[PDB]
């Protein structure tokens, strides 16, 4: 699952719905541990 | 992450040459639909 929000509001241009920022979990190099890492995506990339 | 400002991708074309060439291609293709008829250009329909 992705915990995610619109990135950078109060940018009232044509660039508003673009570029959500999202967050998740990822397995580490070694098997049991977990890792959290964070990224940007476009609004056509990912659906709720 | 984004260094700089926020903009979007846009694509410039030359207006007059574009009109010239499309008038050329419609002046061509009037041979295949009668010399007297009215032709119209519309946008995309839809779908995916």
């Amino acid at each position, epitope marked *: 699952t992705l915990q995610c*929000t619109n990135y950078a509001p*109060n940018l009232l241009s044509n660039m508003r719905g673009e570029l959500k920022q999202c*967050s998740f979990n990822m397995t580490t190099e070694l098997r049991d541990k977990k890792q959290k*890492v964070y990224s*940007l995506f476009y609004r056509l990339d990912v659906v709720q | *992450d*984004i260094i700089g*400002d926020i903009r979007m991708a846009h694509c410039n074309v030359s207006k007059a040459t574009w009109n010239e060439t499309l008038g050329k291609v419609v002046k061509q293709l009037r041979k295949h639909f009668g010399n007297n008829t009215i032709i119209r250009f519309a946008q995309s329909s839809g779908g995916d």
Partner: antibody
Amino acid sequence: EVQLLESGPGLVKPSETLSLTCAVSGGSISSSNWWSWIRQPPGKGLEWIGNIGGSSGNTYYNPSLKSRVTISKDTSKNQFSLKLNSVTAADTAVYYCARDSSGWPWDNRFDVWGAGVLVTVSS
Amino acid sequence: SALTQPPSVSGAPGQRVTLSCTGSTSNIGGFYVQWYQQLPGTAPKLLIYENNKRPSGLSDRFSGSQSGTSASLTITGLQSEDEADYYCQSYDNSLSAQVFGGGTRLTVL
């Protein structure tokens, strides 16, 4: 919140290996996002220091302080301390430590609630 | 940096004062920011719900602001016992800069 975060001073005045600590009692290390550090010269506004990880693996730092200040943590009992090297400037300043209590502080920030008390050196 | 009302503002129990940080498009376009500071002699810490709204649980029932390409706070209502001072915080798009230059000093009659 439950909190006893306290520091251990050091006088590194004509010398270049600054290393001071802090450690809390309440919660745990991976009970928030990380813990942060801010610096203030006595009369100036604030100077922010980039941050650590903790319940994470990624670090952050500060321009005008690049290749200059190294941050770590110890995970024995709430130690997250610093070994900043080669102090040269006249930045005889106060410090504080901070909690996140945050949402996604992860592009930049949701708000820094850092309590602290008095993290003071005049070195 | 940020342009953040040098402390020549005139505080009094008439509550006519404003707080206005000037920000760039990369400054104000980052996010909502703050008004959450307190007295010197101590780590000046209040909390706000990052803008224009009521903070965590309760800190005060007295605030309220907007944000154009701007960081307002016109504050009006008799709270002269809380004669405190304030600062800023922001995220501008210097390289990854959780950065500001805030500072206030206001007064009382």
